[PDB]
Amino acid sequence: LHKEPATLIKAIDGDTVKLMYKGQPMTFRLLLVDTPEFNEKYGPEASAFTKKMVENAKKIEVEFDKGQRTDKYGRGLAYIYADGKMVNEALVRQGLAKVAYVYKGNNTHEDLLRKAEAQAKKEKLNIWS
Numbered sequence: 001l002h003k004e005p006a007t008l009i010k011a012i013d014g015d016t017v018k019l020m021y022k023g024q025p026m027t028f029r030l031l032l033v034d035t036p037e038f039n040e041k042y043g044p045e046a047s048a049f050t051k052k053m054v055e056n057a058k059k060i061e062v063e064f065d066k067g068q069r070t071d072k073y074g075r076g077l078a079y080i081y082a083d084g085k086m087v088n089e090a091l092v093r094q095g096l097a098k099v100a101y102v103y104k105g106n107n108t109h110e111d112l113l114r115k116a117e118a119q120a121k122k123e124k125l126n127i128w129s
């Protein structure tokens, strides 16, 4: 996999972000994670976490996996990096997302996110408390 440049247009929620990619606006949905909706418990916390992370970053990068790059809703499907730190991983580490939507061909970072989930779980962080 390879990292590609992109620019923040707007935070949306815990697992969706609007980005300028190859000069086109696109909604990106984070691979391999599920944050609660804004209206659910830890929803505002998940949204705030992602918001801070992408807004404070100097450099946003997009990394597609080996399978589909767009979902049935026309959302980009990617790992998103903020100053080299993967947003998908950070949410799971913090207990602000569950590992989820793991489909074959788009699962390069599965083991890495499952490690993070195991540590959030042992620490009973947020969703695991």
Ligand SMILES: Cc1cn([C@H]2C[C@H](OP(=O)(O)O)[C@@H](COP(=O)(O)O)O2)c(=O)[nH]c1=O
Binding pocket: 029, 030, 031, 032, 033, 034, 071, 072, 077, 100, 101, 103, 106
């Ligand atoms: C993360 C992800 C979601 N999706 C689709 C499946 C779900 O659609 P259906 O429920 O219609 O089957 C939806 C969940 O997204 P949200 O968690 O953003 O709601 O997005 C993919 O198709 N591939 C993916 O990698």
Ligand SMILES: [Ca+2]
Binding pocket: 015, 034, 035, 036, 037
């Ligand atoms: Ca969600």
